[PDB]
Design a protein around this ligand. Structure first.
Ligand code: CA
Ligand code: CA
Length: 883
């Protein structure tokens, strides 16, 4: 059910805002009902069922600055004063309406009130929430300022009946009770008597604790556990800070994005109880962990795990899970629609979901634990973090503070909106819930939401020693929330909290759209607003320029690395002159991205004109470069959302290409990330040609379409048409590709891709020149050599200078090399790039490539006489000048 009409706002203890006309409103009245008994029958004409009524006086000047700064979208609203003899604290517990009356008489308008403003003004609370343990006692605190009553129900274990109810007492919107230490390890729920607008009734609801630290299966009950308890800690837990991989600089970060279930779902070297969960990471002897160890040893610093907190959509009870038969599905044709039909038939009841469906942020996901009741979810999550740290990998959590799975009074999956209806969720100007994020958008602009987000971040940092956070839809989060979180986390110390907060890294998707766009709800965490914060955002410009098109465009639109102009695929994209100009535009966008996507980096563009990164624009008119630092740029070409790297290349390149050619194209795309300034971001599987059978949104597509094969025998290409819900419109382009045997790589291709990926990682970490930490360093040191109207199409040449000669004008960063030149050649044929500025130097092919298993790259050459660099087709060559 929709929330009722609520077009007025209660913004402070004394002020109500409502966009009503001057002559349209002679006077305005507020009506309250304790029992939610108000109605408006057209036969009677007047509001009935009210316990009280109070006239509001119009406030000529309007709303104070503190309101309009907080809620800018109502800055134009007329202001109405509530007399100070009105018991506001009692009234917010009631059903409320406001009514307008013409200066001639008779009701002209009636509406409900949106209460967050007044709830913050009067009841913002900074004290303890959830459970607090002392030597002799346990206390519980719940923020529920609109509730008429709150009790706690204690349970006989995770499945047993209620044993005891205890009433809580209210003070300033906060309900609390203190009990004996013996309450420890009980299970509980709050019983909350509250007016729910969606049902127009005061209902008695059972809710979990927003500040839960553990749960029974599916969050049915909250476990009253002391998170600091010694028995919940793996061996050596309190010494993990001493074991954490060194991180000299944020500019040294590389990120690998991985789904916890994908990691081990198909790993036969992992035991059956650990497969698909946290424990499979503590299995150091597996093919999966050996794979991560290999990447980590080559230089990978961070693993970004998909949502791992309490989300909806997967049953925590493993015995409820439904599976397909993989042996059967393997016999269906590669372009058949039967595999997806089988998956879709059980997708609501299978073990699989990305997890972008938040219920409680503070608790590990039960389905990823060996037992969803008791201590295992806590212990095993910690075991995972420890195990990753031990193989040289820091751990990033994908956090999803932008929306909730559910709202309203009904269901196991609604918590926040059950307790304080209408507060935690963002609403439009008619009172309906905003759904632009997916459904049930949160409102970080509200005090207690901001508090819950920051408190949750601190929970993961301190209680689980998490090393970083990726913020889903950061643009839906207020900038002030992001900045306070940054201040709070970065001030944690090993002595006082057990973790070095100064090393915690934050980044997010700064997409600016819908109701939050252009600062409508306040300064939000969009890409542009986050410039100069030290918080990273995904660089979509470099992604689209390399791959071609856009997630919202025609799938056949080519880019720099998918054959635009050079290798036309037959989908019409203009004449030769149009496609060549589009190629050169993408080349400029990529070069800005390679230099850290800085707003003030100056590039010679394809017109021959010198332009700042922010002066170069996208097709839709946005500045390409926007950051103040390379650490604010997350460069990527692939991720869990949209088609994998292998699949996008297979769609966009000409059908006539061999998989051998497409293998090198995959490598070029990952090398562009791996050798860029800023922070490279890799989708798990980039390195082994991972396919999802061209699934563009595999969130609910099961283990079948999301397979990671650490035997390296297959890449999951050609396993049927992907689920129709998200893919059907593109099936006609997918079928002939999936059925064509020359599109499928063999084991030798997959292993070659892996070997080359590891090599390019090693090159990144072979020289500090690839990882400059400031905009000044990049502006002084990084040059592009193939520019202007006469640029060679399909070639990028990037030079990086270090101190050389007697008394140089820069610090010496590299003890081994004095200059580095990278040539990205996406042309099918060999190129010869003459760079006279680099003649008479001691360039050699990088030792890693000299000793490469790839025969082609070993053919690369430099000629000192002319500064000529020769690079084979579809190759990235790195040349170094040894000291
Ligand atoms: Ca490592
Ligand atoms: Ca599912």
């Amino acid at each position: 059910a929709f929330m009722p009409d609520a077009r007025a706002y209660w913004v402070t203890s004394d002020l109500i805002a409502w966009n009503v006309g001057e002559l349209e409103a002679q006077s305005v009245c507020l009506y309250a009902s304790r029992a939610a008994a108000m109605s408006l029958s057209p036969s009677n004409g007047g509001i009935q069922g009210y316990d009280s009524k109070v006239e509001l006086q119009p406030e000529s000047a309007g709303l104070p600055e503190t309101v309009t700064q907080k809620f800018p979208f109502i800055s134009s609203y007329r202001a109405f004063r509530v007399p100070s003899s009105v018991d506001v604290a009692s009234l917010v517990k009631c059903q409320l309406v406001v009514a307008s009356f013409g200066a001639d008489g008779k009701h002209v308008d009636v509406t409900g009130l949106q209460l967050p403003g007044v709830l913050d003004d009067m009841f913002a609370y900074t004290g303890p929430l959830g459970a607090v343990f002392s030597e002799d006692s346990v206390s519980l605190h719940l923020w529920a300022p609109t509730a008429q009553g709150v009790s706690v129900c204690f349970f006989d274990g995770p499945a047993g009946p209620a044993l005891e109810t205890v009433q809580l007492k209210e003070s300033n919107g906060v309900w609390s009770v203190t009990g004996p230490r013996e309450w420890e390890n009980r299970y509980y729920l709050y019983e909350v008597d509250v007016y729910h607008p969606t049902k127009a009734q005061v209902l008695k609801c059972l809710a979990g604790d927003p500040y839960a630290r553990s749960l029974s299966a599916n969050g049915a009950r909250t476990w009253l556990v002391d998170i600091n308890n010694e028995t919940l800690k793996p061996a050596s837990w309190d010494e993990l800070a001493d074991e954490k991989p060194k991180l000299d600089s944020f500019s040294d970060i590389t990120i690998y994005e991985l789904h916890i279930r994908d990691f081990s779902a198909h790993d036969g070297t992992v035991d059956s109880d650990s497969r698909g969960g946290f424990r499979a990471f503590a299995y150091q002897a597996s093919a999966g962990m050996e794979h991560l160890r290999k990447l980590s040893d080559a230089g990978l610093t961070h693993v970004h795990l998909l949502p791992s907190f309490h989300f909806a959509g997967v049953d925590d009870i493993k015995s409820n899970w439904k599976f397909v038969d993989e042996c059967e599905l393997a016999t269906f044709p590669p372009g058949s629609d039967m595999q997806q039909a089988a998956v879709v038939a059980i997708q609501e009841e299978d073990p699989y979901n990305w997890g972008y469906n938040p219920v409680l942020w503070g608790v590990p996901k039960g389905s990823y634990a060996s037992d969803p009741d008791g201590p295992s979810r806590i212990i095993e999550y910690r075991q995972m973090v420890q195990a990753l740290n031990r193989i040289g990998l820091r751990v990033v959590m994908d956090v999803v503070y932008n929306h909730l799975d559910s709202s309203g009074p009904c269901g196991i999956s609604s918590v926040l909106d059950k307790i304080v209806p209408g507060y935690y969720v963002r609403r439009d100007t008619n009172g309906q819930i905003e759904n632009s994020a997916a459904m049930n958008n949160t409102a970080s602009e509200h005090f207690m939401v901001d508090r819950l987000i920051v408190d949750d971040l601190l929970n993961w940092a301190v209680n689980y020693k998490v090393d970083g956070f990726r913020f889903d839809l950061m643009g839906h989060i207020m900038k002030r929330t992001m900045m306070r979180a940054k201040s709070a986390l970065q001030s944690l110390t090993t002595d006082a909290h057990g973790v070095d907060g100064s090393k915690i890294y934050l980044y997010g998707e700064g997409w600016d759209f819908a109701e939050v766009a252009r600062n409508q709800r306040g300064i939000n965490g969009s890409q542009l607003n986050m410039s100069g914060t030290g918080i990273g955002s995904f660089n979509d410009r470099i992604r689209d320029a390399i791959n071609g098109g856009n997630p919202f465009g025609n799938p056949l639109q080519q880019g720099f690395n998918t054959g635009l102009f050079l290798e036309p695929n037959g989908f019409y994209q203009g004449n030769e002159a149009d496609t060549r100009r589009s190629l050169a535009t993408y080349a400029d966008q990529i070069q800005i991205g390679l230099a850290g996507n800085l707003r003030d980096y100056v590039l010679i563009s394809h017109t021959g004109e010198a332009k700042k990164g922010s002066e170069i624009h996208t097709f839709d008119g946005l500045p390409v470069g926007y950051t103040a630092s390379p650490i604010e740029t997350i460069n990527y070409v692939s991720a869990h959302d949209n088609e994998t790297l292998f699949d996008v290349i297979s769609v966009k390149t000409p059908m006539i290409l061999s998989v051998d050619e497409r293998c090198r194209i995959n490598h070029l795309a990952s090398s562009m990330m791996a050798l860029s300034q800023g922070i490279p971001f890799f989708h798990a599987g980039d390195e082994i040609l991972r396919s999802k059978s061209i699934d563009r949104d595999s969130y609910n597509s099961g283990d079948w379409f999301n397979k990671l094969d650490f035997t390296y025998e297959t890449n999951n290409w050609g396993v049927g048409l992907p689920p129709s819900e998200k893919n059907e419109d593109n099936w006609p382009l997918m079928k002939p590709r999936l059925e064509n045997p020359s599109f499928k790589p063999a084991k030798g291709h997959i292993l070659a891709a892996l070997d080359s990926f590891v090599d390019i990682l090693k090159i990144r970490y072979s020289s500090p020149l690839f990882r400059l930490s400031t905009a000044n360093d990049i502006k002084q040191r990084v040059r592009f050599h193939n520019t202007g109207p006469s640029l060679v199409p399909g070639v990028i040449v990037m030079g990086i200078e270090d101190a050389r000669g007697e008394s140089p004008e820069m610090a010496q960063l590299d003890t081994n090399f004095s200059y580095v030149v990278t040539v990205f050649n996406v042309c099918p044929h060999e190129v010869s790039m003459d760079i006279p500025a680099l003649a008479s130097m001691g360039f050699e092919l990088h030792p890693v490539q000299v000793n490469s298993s790839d025969t082609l790259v070993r053919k690369s050459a430099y000629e000192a006489a002319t500064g000529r660099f020769t690079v084979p087709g579809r190759t990235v060559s790195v040349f170094v000048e040894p000291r």
